[PDB]
From Swiss-Prot:
SMART domains: Arrestin_C (SM01017)
InterPro entries: Arrestin, Arrestin-like_C, Arrestin-like_N, Arrestin_C-like, Arrestin_CS, Arrestin_N, Ig_E-set
Disulfide-bond pairs as recorded: none
Protein name: S-arrestin
Record bears the keyword Lyase: no
A Pfam family that the UniProt record links to this protein: Arrestin_N
Gene from which this protein is expressed: sag
Organism per entry: Xenopus laevis (African clawed frog)
Binding partners and assembly: Interacts with RHO (via the phosphorylated C-terminus).
Family: Belongs to the arrestin family.
Length: 362
């Protein structure tokens, strides 16, 4: 039941059709943006029609196109003239052949490649107070008509589609994250040993993360609490050096571990945007008002990269923490912690209808 997405200018002259709203970064390659522009030669006053792909960092507002932006940096730009055809034909995708069958002779195909240096879609949801801290990386497909490229491009003559670049890679094979720490308290004869492990390195939005915690308490002190959490750390790397950290999942266990006792337990942590709607100064992969918006993926920096092109560096870790105390009198508590980095990823996005491009609301 394959769906195609479309959107048209107000002047109805140009009209863009795409196979997807979201194009997948596969780490070593990116699905290109292939679609067709449907023009009306008569409405076009002998004009040419171009399509552009633009990746931009924005800071200060929640879109690149709105006025009031403190800062904008264009990370990538590419333009292709689809009409009149400047020949250079290519092997149409199945999507483009299908689209053209149904749309007829005024459907001209295009393909716009992503380079490998670009970031994925990432957005920082600001605090309701500090909305000037909003920033992110937007991708825009824009088709438009013009007599001369020097001329201003009116909103009526153009059509913008705000696509996403989302990242997926397989979770096997990989390593098993593991972290140990020992702490021998003053006048304890043996130490308290803490161990945490994950089954793999890569997890997908919606996938429970099971943390295996293991405590060997040879101390004289008592473990009074055991918490396991997901922490999202964000580092803005363009315009300003904003830092953010958010707990996006937490499971605790008041089950004590007495002196001279051991304890094994698995936790199951679900870092979903569903349970973090209230939170702000948090990194997402879209606008909060859309259904398809998730938490942000882990930033994968590639060898010899300019970090700053990423716009926002996002990383995830599990934190396991034991709260430890004496049994009576001196109740001074102490924490014993271990951290497990992991990669959070978009899950794999596994006749012909047309839907409007606009993304489903919440």
């Amino acid at each position: 039941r394959h769906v195609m997405y479309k959107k048209t200018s107000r002047d109805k002259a140009v009209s863009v059709y795409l196979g997807k709203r979201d194009y997948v970064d596969h780490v070593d390659s990116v699905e290109p943006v292939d679609g067709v522009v449907l023009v009306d030669p008569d409405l076009l006053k002998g004009k040419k029609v171009y399509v552009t792909l633009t990746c931009a960092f924005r800071y200060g507002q929640e879109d690149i196109d709105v006025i009031g932006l403190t800062f904008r940096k264009d990370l990538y730009y590419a333009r292709t003239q689809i009409y009149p055809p400047v020949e250079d034909p290519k092997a149409l995708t199945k999507v483009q052949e299908r689209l053209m069958k149904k749309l007829g002779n005024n459907a001209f195909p295009f393909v716009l490649e992503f380079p490998d240096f670009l970031p994925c879609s990432v957005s920082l949801q600001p605090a309701p107070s500090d909305v000037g801290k909003a920033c992110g990386v937007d991708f825009e497909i824009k088709a438009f008509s013009t007599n001369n490229l020097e001329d201003r491009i009116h909103k009526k003559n153009s059509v913008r589609l705000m696509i996403r670049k989302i990242q997926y890679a397989p979770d096997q094979p990989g390593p098993k994250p593991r972290a140990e720490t020992s702490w021998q308290f003053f006048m304890s004869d043996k130490p308290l040993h803490l161990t945490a492990s994950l089954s793999k390195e890569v997890f997908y939005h919606g996938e429970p993360i099971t943390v295996s915690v293991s405590v060997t308490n040879k101390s004289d002190k008592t473990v009074k609490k055991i918490s396991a959490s997901v922490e999202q750390v964000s580092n803005v790397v363009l315009y300003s050096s904003d830092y953010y950290i958010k707990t996006v999942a937490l499971e605790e266990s008041n089950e004590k571990v007495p002196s001279k006792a051991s304890y094994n337990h698995t936790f199951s942590l679900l870092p979903l945007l569903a349970y973090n709607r209230e939170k702000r100064e948090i990194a997402l992969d879209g606008k909060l008002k859309h259904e398809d918006t998730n938490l942000a993926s882990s930033t994968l920096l590639k060898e010899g990269t300019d970090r700053t092109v990423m716009g926002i560096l996002v990383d995830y870790k599990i934190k396991v923490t034991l709260t430890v105390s004496g049994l009576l009198g001196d109740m001074t508590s102490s924490e014993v912690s271990t951290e497990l980095p992991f990669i959070l990823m978009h899950p794999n996005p596994d006749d012909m209808v047309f839907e409007e491009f606009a993304r489903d609301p919440l």
